[PDB]
Design a protein around this ligand. Sequence first.
Ligand SMILES: CCCCCCCCCO
Ligand SMILES: CCCCCCCCCO
Lengths: 219, 103, 103, 106, 106
Amino acid sequence: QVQLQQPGAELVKPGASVKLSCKASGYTFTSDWIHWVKQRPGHGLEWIGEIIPSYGRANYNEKIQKKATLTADKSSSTAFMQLSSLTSEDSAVYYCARERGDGYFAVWGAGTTVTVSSAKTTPPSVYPLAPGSAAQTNSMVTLGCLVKGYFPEPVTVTWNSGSLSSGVHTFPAVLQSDLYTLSSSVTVPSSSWPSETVTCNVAHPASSTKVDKKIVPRD
Amino acid sequence: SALHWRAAGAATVLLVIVLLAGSYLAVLAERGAPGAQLITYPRALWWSVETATCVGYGDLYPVTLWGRLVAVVVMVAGITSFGLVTAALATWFVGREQERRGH
Amino acid sequence: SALHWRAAGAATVLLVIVLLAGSYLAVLAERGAPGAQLITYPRALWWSVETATCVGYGDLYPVTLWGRLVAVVVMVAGITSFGLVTAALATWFVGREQERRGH
Amino acid sequence: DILLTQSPAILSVSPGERVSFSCRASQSIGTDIHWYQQRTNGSPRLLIKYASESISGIPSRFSGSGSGTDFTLSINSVESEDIANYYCQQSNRWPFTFGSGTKLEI
Amino acid sequence: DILLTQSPAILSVSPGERVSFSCRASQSIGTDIHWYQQRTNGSPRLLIKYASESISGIPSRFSGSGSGTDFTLSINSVESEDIANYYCQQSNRWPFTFGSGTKLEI
Ligand SMILES: CCCCCCCCCO
Ligand SMILES: CCCCCCCCCO
């Protein structure tokens, strides 16, 4: 079971602050340290700081401007990171990781995508992508779903509630006028559709919305 | 069981406790100090033992005030503990020799 | 208070004095020697303790004649002091055992 | 602070060939180097700890070597699932630091 | 004798931007590096001691980092009053030595 649970996203206005959480499960030792790593789009892993919950002591990366404050709650086994007075430079995925006091990060959280912007949250509109009438099919058929007009990132697209993983491409989003848009592609044996159902599940953590969209032949 | 043997045992258990707490506390004190190497528990425990025995290879050592204070406690606990075993051995030999001399 | 306990205490206070004077004097002796690291009081005090306990990590040590002479005094004072505590512990155990033997 | 240099930034290999990633530390760090795999949009995943010790759940074609300042992460017979970014990380001295990462292309 | 290299000799930055001064020691000196600020016709003034420890009276936008041979003095959001020469100085080995200094231009 997931050892470290982090919220998917957080929208923050420039100047404002946010408190990210990291709920841990599994084995817990007094020698455990919870670390936080920052990763900006396209860049590498940058260490932010660490904290030892059993004692409450926290250390921070001295090479970068201090934006975080780490605390921990032993009773709820949760570690927190307060990011304050953010700017677009603080927009990135923030991972929490657990180290058993022996130097390596044995487990990482899924990460929370933080977006620092003035724009407003906007859930995505999900439209189906079924072949046209004159489209000739082969031994395989390609279907998809359009995820348009959302903010901020990200969205998680699955097929048939995750049971359909092979033959799936979810293209990187494209930003235009404070709104993102992407499409996801799925390919299955032409003989299996529409006999066997195909549905895309779109989760947009920033707005707590998860919508489904069944792909049916055009007619 | 005579006193000296009891104190020896107690000294030993206490040393073990000092080693474990010392290892834990050294890491706590040293993390946060750029350049520190006494920062993971396994090697910290080894550092605590070679400190308690005063061998001090120099492969690991504290660079902070509190790490160093923790080191002093470990050193003193080790010296005291082993010194106490020596005193117990002396008492044992003194007793045996007094008997052998018919006193 | 028996002699050995009194001497132990005195040995301890004296060691503390030797450590402080040793730290002060080491700096005085070492500054002026290109390459010397035993040149600031805080780490010199730490150097004095790890020398008195004979741990000798090797993170700091004197390079001059007088710094080394100062080191010898610290070493001897530490060895003597801790050795004296051991002797006091032995006396304590010897006394207790003589009683327990009804002598 | 220990600088970890991962060069080249990108490695291209044909399917099935053995590939090696380089990690050079700015100073000697014994074997306190760990390797992570990060696939597109995924979180980092531990592959090798302490330079050469294997982790359970990780394919056998993954191995690491080296000590001192030079380390290597090797993949015997690379396959599509190996496509990702690879990072080294040191735990010899505070603070822990990460290398810039090398991408594997097939 | 420890040589402290401060390069570049001059740093130009736009108002409000973060700036970083480099100080490289000819050999490892732990964190025994200190930073001073000297304005035109003024005497040197202590900014950071032991590489990263702050001094009272010095603005919070001033911070330092590094250990070993490489050190950095950073100013978060530089302003006019920061215009001056910046020197690093080592106290790890005798004799104490100073770097050549870096000028900050806005
Ligand atoms: C002997 C008491 C040791 C206490 C160690 C505390 C370390 C705190 C570091 O910041
Ligand atoms: C035991 C006497 C030590 C005296 C130290 C004097 C140092 C003088 C250095 O030039």
